[PDB]
Every structure is written in structure tokens, then in C-alpha cells.
Amino acid sequence: MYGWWGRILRVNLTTGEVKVQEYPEEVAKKFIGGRGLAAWILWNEARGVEPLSPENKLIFAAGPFNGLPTPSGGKLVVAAKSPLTGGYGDGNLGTMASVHLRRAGYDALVVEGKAKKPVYIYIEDDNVSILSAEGLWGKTTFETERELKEIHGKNVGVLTIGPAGENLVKYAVVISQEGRAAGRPGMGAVMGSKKLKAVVIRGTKEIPVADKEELKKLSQEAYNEILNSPGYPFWKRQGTMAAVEWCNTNYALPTRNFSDGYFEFARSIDGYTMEGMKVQQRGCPYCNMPCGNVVLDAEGQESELDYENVALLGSNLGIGKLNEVSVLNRIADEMGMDTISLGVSIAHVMEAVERGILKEGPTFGDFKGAKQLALDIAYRKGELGNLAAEGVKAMAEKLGTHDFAMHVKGLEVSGYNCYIYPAMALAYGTSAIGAHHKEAWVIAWEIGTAPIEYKISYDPIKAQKVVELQRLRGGLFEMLTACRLPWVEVGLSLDYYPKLLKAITGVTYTWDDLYKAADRVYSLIRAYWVREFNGKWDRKMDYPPKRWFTEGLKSGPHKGEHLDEKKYDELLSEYYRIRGWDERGIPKKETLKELDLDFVIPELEKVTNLE
């Protein structure tokens, strides 16, 4: 076997047992890695488990591209049954831990059980130990990684959780290298529930490559193509922050809990403003187009800015000064909580306060109040911090505020306001893990323009475009696993991927093979949700928030415009037709058989009727 090790590191925190599981080359070829491998593991090992119980499996899954010098191939997938959504949950982050896990001889790391006290997992090739982290517990993510490196050396990959993870904030994430984050659906809370403070990894092994020279050649070509792309200069300057102006121009910038798609103060929180306050730039392993832009916040502290962070903690909160939004951003990284769900939870509180629903709490534009709430959420201080720490779905159940609860499947909607964007609304509605733009950022195509540089339509071809994008963004890139931005942003040819894959693994994958592996992952993931939800499931699970159907844009040429539910419903049926799912969004028996998921049928039938 080349590329894949066929090895998965297993750590049981309850028993202290550490072992290496060998999985068949057939499974590796069939699921490829990252999310695929994770979905296979969770389907088999997390049936009916409580997300915060010792039985949940915390998975760190790499893929064949990882550990090797592949173009922006320093990504890693973190997965577990989600404490926020109750379904399959995952996330991705660039981190040296990805390079080291693979160079240490493993394709993935699976943590089960729960330690008796705070501990961290140490991995140096074949030497794996569960060590006491009593001294680290309570420290920020930044401080935890800094201290671990002060002991073991700079040459290690470190994954940590901060107080939000330790306190089981439902959208707590895993942090690496002060800025890289993974696991919006609460991977950080699953990590915290096991009393797992960090993971330190070092690898030195040579990963067996089927064609060393092709690999080295293809990689050099791709790097050069990136360096020579016309978008490279502007990408180097603004990175994802170029989307603030682009979204504002197109009425897609979430403003005041998604109330409007335009923000009057977007310029003072945009990419140009960011350029003027940038002090450093860093990136993920093996990437020659770094986009981790670091600024100084209002308190003079370094903060790494990404578009989503700014959109959800800036315009979405009615906060118009980038230096202030940057303080909130830093807090999220330090505490280890998702900037998106954090911002949407805060915005939800702000709307409830302005409406008189909540007697106390911050209002839109209130930076000091937003900062205090962010901190109270991470430390679960007071009734408000505790409520908001649960996310908008849970919070809305308690407050009767479902009308303005911006989420899909319990996962908070990200940085694109879709009052007039049917395809993007469908992307959020059908995202495998819950509302996220990860799997299909189709709004650009719907508009005809993109950040590096209108008539509302429900054409069934939009459902086809979303499935196509999900195959690449929610499948391929989450399985390799590698950054999708070189392709998305600078236009690196997708042809490099199946070639790099054969050069590495020696297996020839055609685009249809890849499209099929991605579809298998999608149906398996959906199957997981259906099974864990005990068959209680229908098409409404794939609907975007009610706000986009009952309210419209508040300003500009498109004022009053919104989504037509009837037409959205028809577009959803088209999505199901293309995926081979029934009108409830559940995979059909024939579809499962065709995707080599026969094993799913018996289990799903114990819970509902299949078609």
C-alpha cells in the first residue's frame, strides 16, 4: 500500500490503553481520508452515543496528501458526533499536527473515553503517551501551545482547546498556531468532555510514495501556477477579507443578526482597512499563498483575521470598527470558540434585547457589551452567558425566538445573507454538517462576480451546481485533505488533484470515481443523521431559516425581496432527485446499494421505512 499507512492510532483515555488499528486498503480507497474516513469510523463506533459522554469518538483524520509536500496540503479534519447538532459533525484546520501525524506513521488518531484528570496526548513516531495536563488546564489556547513548545521544542504540531472547550460551550473548537481553527459543531467541547487539553505530535518517517518524481514534479508545477496567477497579488494583500466589500456590494453581508444584507459601516471593517493595520502574515503548512493576516486590535494585541470572523463579529453585531471586532476575534481564538456561532449567538441575544424579549444584555453596536458576553460565554458566567453558550437553536427554544434563530440543523448560518440567493440558501439548507458555506459557496456563481476581482432565479440547474460543488468542497478537499482556496481563489487547475492522488497512492481515480466517493460520503453522513435522530426526519431539516422566507432585505435596489418557499421547496426536490434521496431527504435503498453502502440499509430500516 502506498500513500495511506492503513494505520489509525487509538487512544482510550478511560483505560489508558494505546493501540494501532489496521484498516484494509479497500476502506482507504473507498473513503480516501479525512471526512470520509471519519464518517466510516463514526457510523461504526458512535451509534446512539451522547455527544459529551466518554463513548463519543473524537477523530483527527488526515488523508494521503498530508505529511507530504503537496500544494496547501497541510489540512486536518476533526470529527465527532456533534454536541451542538446531535448529528455528524466535523471541521478542518491547517496545522503542523497534520504533517506530523502522518509522518509519525498514522492516517488518523481516534480518542475515546474520558481521562480522570486533565491530560494531553503526546505522539512522537511510535512513542505515544497520555500525560498529565493539570498545569495547563484553564490556560488559553495560545498559552497552552506556547508552554508545550517551551518544553518539547518548536518542531511539533499542537492542537489545543481553551476555556470554552473546557467549559463545554456547544460551539467550542480546536485551535492550532494562534488562529487556525476546526470544528464549529462543537469538536472543542467533545475534546473538553474527555478532559483532553491538547495533542502534541512529531513525526519523522518517510511516507511511502508510489511515484516520488511525479509527486515532486506536479507539486512544483502547481506552486508555480499559484505564484503566477493574476489573483495572487491581491490574494496576498487581502486574503478572504476581500469578501467584506464584495458581500456588501451584493447585499449578502450579514448585518444585525442577518436583518439586512448591507452595513453602513462596512468600509471601516473591510479588506482595505485590514491592509492598513496588518503587522504579520502567516499560513498553513506547505502553502505558498499564506492568508493568515495578522493585525493589531484596539488593545494592541495581535489578531488573525478571516472574513467570517469579521462578518459575524462585525456587521452581524452592528460593530463598525475593525480594531474592536479584532478584540472579539482574538477572544474567540484564545478561548477556543467558533467565531461564527459565537457571533450569531451574540447577534441573536442583541435582537432579543432590542425587542424587549431579554430584559438585559448587549444591543447592536455595543462593543463593550459584546466583549463581556463573549467572555461570559467562554467561562459560562451567569444565566446569559450560559444560555448563549448553547447556541441559537437551544437558546431560541428557551426564549421562544425561533423567528430570528439563524441556523440549519442547529449549526449557525455563516457569512452570507441569502434573502435573494436561492442556490446559496439551498447550500446552507443541505450542508452535511448543518449551516456552513464550506461545502458549497455558490453565491459567487449565482452573482457572476467574485471577491478577488441581478435577478432572483430558481432554475433546477442550481441544485445541480450545489451537488457539483459539494462533491469537490465537502468531498474531495475534505478527504485529501487539502486547502480548497488555491482553486477557489487563484484558479489553480483541479486537474492536479487526481494526478497527485495517483502519484501518491498509485491508484488511478477518474473524476467520476471521485464524484462517486464524495456522494458515498454524503449519503453515509445523511444516514448517520437519520439513524441518530431515530428516524425522526423530513425535508424541513434541509430548509434554510424562516427569516429568509418571511422577511426581506431592508435597503438598496432589492429592498423587500426574499425567498419564495414554494419555489425553494421545488428546488429542494431537484436536489433530492439528483442525489437519489426521497422527499424526506433520506437516501433510497437503490442509491445506498449503488454507492456501496448496503450496510446502511438494515440500520436505517430499524428506525424508518426506506424507499
Peptide bond into 481 cis (omega under 30): yes
Each as own residue / partner, the long-range contacts of residues 260-267 (CB below 8 Å, 24 or more positions apart, any chain) are 260/417, 260/553, 260/554, 260/555, 261/417, 261/419, 261/420, 261/553, 261/556, 261/558, 262/553, 262/554, 262/555, 262/556, 263/314, 263/315, 263/318, 263/320, 264/320, 265/315, 265/320, 265/321, 266/315, 266/320
- Select from 124, 302, 376, 603 the one that contacts its own copies (CB under 8 A): 124
CA angle 294, 182, 29 (to 5 degrees): 125
Min CB(227)–ligand SF4 separation in Å: 13
Task: Work out whether 101 is an interface residue with its own copies (CB under 8 A).
Answer: no
- Residues 400-420 as b or e (16 or more Cβ within 10 Å = b): ebeebbbbbbbbbbbbbbbbb
DSSP string, 370-400: HHHHHHHHHHT-HHHHHHHTT-HHHHHHHHT
For residues 477 to 516, the per-residue mask of contacts with ligand SF4, x marking binding by CB under 6 A and - elsewhere, is ------x-x-------------------------------
For residues 229 to 268, the per-residue mask of contacts with its own copies, x marking binding by CB under 8 A and - elsewhere, is ----------------------------------------
- Select from 152, 267, 278, 465 the one that contacts its own copies (CB under 8 A): 152
Task: Work out whether 287 is an interface residue with ligand SF4 (CB under 6 A).
Answer: yes
Task: Work out whether 132 is an interface residue with its own copies (CB under 8 A).
Answer: yes
For residues 179 to 218, the per-residue mask of contacts with its own copies, x marking binding by CB under 8 A and - elsewhere, is -----------------------x----------------
Q: How many residues bind ligand SF4 (CB under 6 A)?
A: 11
Q: Contact region for ligand SF4 (CB under 6 A) — 200-208, 281-289, 537-545, 554-562?
A: 281-289
Min CB(493)–ligand SF4 separation in Å: 16
- Map the footprint of its own copies across residues 375-414, applying CB under 8 A: none
Query: 183 or 283: whose CB is closer to ligand SF4?
Result: 283
CB 382 within 8 A of CB 367: no
Distances (CA, A) of 160 to 169, 233, 309, 500: 15, 33, 19, 31
Query: 289 or 396: whose CB is closer to ligand SF4?
Result: 289
Task: Work out whether 121 is an interface residue with its own copies (CB under 8 A).
Answer: no
For residues 429 to 468, the per-residue mask of contacts with ligand SF4, x marking binding by CB under 6 A and - elsewhere, is ----------------------------------------
- Select from 12, 21, 53, 129 the one that contacts its own copies (CB under 8 A): 129
Query: 127 or 224: whose CB is closer to its own copies?
Result: 127
CB 377 within 8 A of CB 341: no
Task: Work out whether 327 is an interface residue with ligand SF4 (CB under 6 A).
Answer: no
Min CB(93)–ligand SF4 separation in Å: 9
HSE, CB side, 13 Å, CA atoms: give it for residue 540.
Answer: 3
Q: Which residue is nearest to ligand SF4 (CB)?
A: 283
Min CB(13)–its own copies separation in Å: 12
Q: Which residue has the cell 440543523?
A: 409
Task: Work out whether 284 is an interface residue with ligand SF4 (CB under 6 A).
Answer: yes
- Residues 559-584 as b or e (16 or more Cβ within 10 Å = b): eeebbeeeebeebbebbbeebbbbeb
Task: Work out whether 484 is an interface residue with its own copies (CB under 8 A).
Answer: no
- Select from 15, 22, 48, 151 the one that contacts its own copies (CB under 8 A): 151
Query: 199 or 312: whose CB is closer to its own copies?
Result: 199
- Alpha-carbon radius of gyration of the chain: 22
- Select from 14, 127, 280, 493 the one that contacts its own copies (CB under 8 A): 127
Cell of 284: 498553513
Min CB(77)–ligand SF4 separation in Å: 14
Cα(555)–Cα(557) distance, integer angstroms: 7
Min CB(341)–ligand SF4 separation in Å: 19
Query: 133 or 500: whose CB is closer to its own copies?
Result: 133
Edge-to-edge strands of the sheet including 302-305?
278-282, 292-296, 302-305
Min CB(583)–its own copies separation in Å: 54
HSE, CB side, 13 Å, CA atoms: give it for residue 344.
Answer: 33
Task: Work out whether 67 is an interface residue with ligand SF4 (CB under 6 A).
Answer: no
Neighbours of 498 (CB within 10 A): 17
Task: Work out whether 155 is an interface residue with its own copies (CB under 8 A).
Answer: yes
Task: Work out whether 154 is an interface residue with its own copies (CB under 8 A).
Answer: yes
Q: Which residue has the cell 460565554?
A: 377
Please, what is the angle between helix 339-354 and helix 322-335, to 10°? 120
- Map the footprint of its own copies across residues 10-69, applying CB under 8 A: 16
Cα(287)–Cα(239) distance, integer angstroms: 13
CB 281 within 8 A of CB 293: yes
Partner that binds at residue 349, options ligand SF4, its own copies, none, CB closer than 5 to 8 Å by kind: none
Phi then psi for 406, rounded to 5 degrees? -85, 85
Q: Contact region for its own copies (CB under 8 A) — 19-27, 34-42, 92-100, 143-151?
A: 143-151
For residues 70 to 109, the per-residue mask of contacts with ligand SF4, x marking binding by CB under 6 A and - elsewhere, is --x---------------------x---------------
Secondary structure of residue 600 in the 3-state scheme: helix
Q: How many residues bind its own copies (CB under 8 A)?
A: 23
Min CB(131)–its own copies separation in Å: 6
Neighbours of 90 (CB within 10 A): 28
CB 219 within 8 A of CB 70: yes
- Surface-to-core class of residue 216, CB atoms within 10 Å of its CB (0-12 exposed, 13-18 middle, 19+ buried): middle
Binding site for ligand SF4 (CB under 6 A): 72, 94, 283-284, 287, 289-292, 483, 485
Binding site for its own copies (CB under 8 A): 16, 122, 124, 127, 129-136, 147-156, 202
